[PDB]
Structure 1
Amino acid sequence: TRTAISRREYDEWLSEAASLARALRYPVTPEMVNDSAGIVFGDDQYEAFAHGLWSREPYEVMVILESLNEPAVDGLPAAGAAHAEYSGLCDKLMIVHPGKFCPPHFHQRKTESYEVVLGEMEVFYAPEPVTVGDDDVLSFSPMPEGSPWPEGVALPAGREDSYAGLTSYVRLRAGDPKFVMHRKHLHAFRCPADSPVPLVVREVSTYSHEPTAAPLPQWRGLHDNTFVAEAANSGRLATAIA
C-alpha cells in the first residue's frame, strides 16, 4: 500500500491543477503552487495514487490553491479581539478529481460559501449544527434541509462510517447562486465519479486557521478543522512526497 506520493506524481498533479485554474481565470501565483497545496487526508489515502486521479476510485485527496487568507484584524476595535477569529477573509480554489472527496469535518469558527467553476459539486452535510460547549450561539439563516443522498455515492473504503451524520444533500453547478455552509456544521463534498472533468470550486470563507508573528496572540497554534475520521483528524497535515 502507498505511503507517499512521488515527486513526479505530485508535480504533475499540482501543475495540471494550476494550469486548469489559470485557464478558468483564477489568479495563481508561483508561491501558491507549493508542496502543501496537494492534500492527502490520512496515510491510508495515499493509496489514491496507486491507480491515479483518473481511476475514479473513492479517496479523500484534493488540491487547494489559496489566493487569500486575510485576518482582517487591522482596524478592528480592540474590544472585538475575542471573536476576530470567526471573521477574516479566505479565497481558495479547490480542485477535486472524479470520485474524490473533501472529508467529513466541521469548523468551530469558519463559515464558508461555494461557487462551482467547472463540473458539479455534490455537497453532504448535517442540517443541524454540532454542539460546541454550553455556548449561547446566534441564529439568523439556518442551513436548508436539503435533499436525501442520491444513488451513486461511492464512499472511501474504511471511512464510510464518518459520513453517517452528513444526512443532507445538495448538488451545485456553475451559475447557481452562492451556497453558504455555516460554521459548526459537519460537511464534505465530492466530484461525481462519472464527471468528465475535475470539479473546480471557488470557496470564499472567513479566515482559515490551519498549520503552515500571528495576527493575534490567541491565534497561535489554533486549529479550526475537526475531521470525523481519526486518520484524517490526527495526522493529515504535511504531504509526504518521495
Structure 2
Amino acid sequence: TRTAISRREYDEWLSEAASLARALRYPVTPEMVNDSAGIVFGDDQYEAFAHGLWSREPYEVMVILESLNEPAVDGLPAAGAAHAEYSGLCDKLMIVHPGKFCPPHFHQRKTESYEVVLGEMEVFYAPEPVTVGDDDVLSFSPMPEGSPWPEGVALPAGREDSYAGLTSYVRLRAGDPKFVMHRKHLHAFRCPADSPVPLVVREVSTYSHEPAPLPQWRGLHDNTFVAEAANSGRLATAIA
C-alpha cells in the first residue's frame, strides 16, 4: 500500500495543475505552487497514486491553488475581534481529477461559494446545519434542499459511510451562478468519474484557518472531517 507520493508524481501533478490554472487565466504565482498545494486526505488515500489521477478511481485527493487568504482584520473595530475569525477573504482554485473527491467536512467559521470554471462539480451536502456549541446563531437564507443523489456515484473505499449525512445534491456547471455553502454545513464534492477534464472550481470564501493576524487565530484549525482518517493527513503531504 502506498504511503507517500514520489517527487516526480507530485511535481507532474502540480505542474499540470498550475498550467491548466494559467490556461484558464487564474493568477498563479510561483509561491502558490508548493509542496502543500497537493492534498492527500489520510495516509490510506496515498493509494490514489497507485494507478494515478486518471484512473478515475474514487479517492479523496486534490490540488488547491490559493491566490488569496486575507484576514481583513485591519480597520476592524476591536469590539469585533471575537468574531473576526468568521470573516476575512479567501480565493482559491481547486482542481479535482475524474472520480476524485474533496472529503466530507464542515467549517465552524468558514462560509464558501463555488464558481465552476471547467468540467462539472457534483456537490453532496447536509441542508441542515450542524449545531456546534448551541449559542444563539443567526439566520437569513438557509441552504436550499437540493435534490437526491443521482445513481452511480462511487465513494472512496472505507470512507463511504462518512458521506451518509450529506443527503442533498447539486450539479454545478461552468457559467452557473455562484453556489453558497454556509458555515456549519457538512459538504463534499467530486469530479464526475466520466469527465473528460479535471474539475476546476474557484472558491471564494471567508478566511481559511489551516495551520497570527490575531492572537486568538493562533493554531486555529477550522476544518473538521467526518472521517477520522482525513484529519491526520493533509497536515503535510508525504513526498518521497
SS for the counterpart of 1:46 is helix
SS for the counterpart of 2:183 is coil
Matched residue, 1:4: 4
SS for the counterpart of 1:233 is helix
* 1:226 paired to 2:224: yes
Query: CA offset at residue 77 of structure 1?
Result: 0.4
Identity, % of aligned pairs?
100
TM-score by length of 1: 0.99
SS for the counterpart of 2:50 is helix
Cα RMSD of the aligned pairs, angstroms, is 0.5
SS for the counterpart of 1:75 is coil
* 1:203 paired to 2:203: yes
Whole-angstrom CA distance in 2 between matches of 1:234 and 1:50: 20
1:90-129 Cα distance to aligned partner (Å, 9 max, x none)? 0000000000000000000000000000000000000000
Whole-angstrom CA distance in 2 between matches of 1:152 and 1:22: 32
SS for the counterpart of 2:14 is helix
1:155-177 Cα distance to aligned partner (Å, 9 max, x none)? 00000010000000000001100
Whole-angstrom CA distance in 1 between matches of 2:206 and 2:148: 28
Matched residue, 1:178: 178
Which range is displaced more, 227-236 or 96-105?
A: 227-236
Asked if the contact 2:40/2:233 (under 8 Å) is kept, the reply is no
SS for the counterpart of 1:47 is helix
Query: CA offset at residue 236 of structure 1?
Result: 2.8
Whole-angstrom CA distance in 2 between matches of 1:162 and 1:131: 18
Whole-angstrom CA distance in 2 between matches of 1:33 and 1:235: 19
Matched residue, 2:86: 86
Whole-angstrom CA distance in 1 between matches of 2:177 and 2:71: 26
Query: CA offset at residue 152 of structure 1?
Result: 1.7
Query: CA offset at residue 233 of structure 1?
Result: 1.6
Matched residue, 1:165: 165
Runs in 1 of length 4+ with deviation above 6 angstroms? none
Q: Which runs of 5 or more structure 1 residues have no equivalent in the other structure? A: none
Query: CA offset at residue 151 of structure 1?
Result: 1.1
SS for the counterpart of 1:92 is strand
Whole-angstrom CA distance in 2 between matches of 1:79 and 1:231: 38
Asked if the contact 2:2/2:47 (under 8 Å) is kept, the reply is yes
Whole-angstrom CA distance in 2 between matches of 1:8 and 1:101: 22
1:114-149 Cα distance to aligned partner (Å, 9 max, x none)? 000000000000000001112110000000000000
TM-score by length of 2: 0.99
Whole-angstrom CA distance in 1 between matches of 2:73 and 2:25: 29
Whole-angstrom CA distance in 1 between matches of 2:132 and 2:141: 19
Query: CA offset at residue 235 of structure 1?
Result: 3.3
Whole-angstrom CA distance in 1 between matches of 2:168 and 2:130: 14
Asked if the contact 2:130/2:186 (under 8 Å) is kept, the reply is yes
- Count of aligned positions: 240
Whole-angstrom CA distance in 2 between matches of 1:128 and 1:184: 9
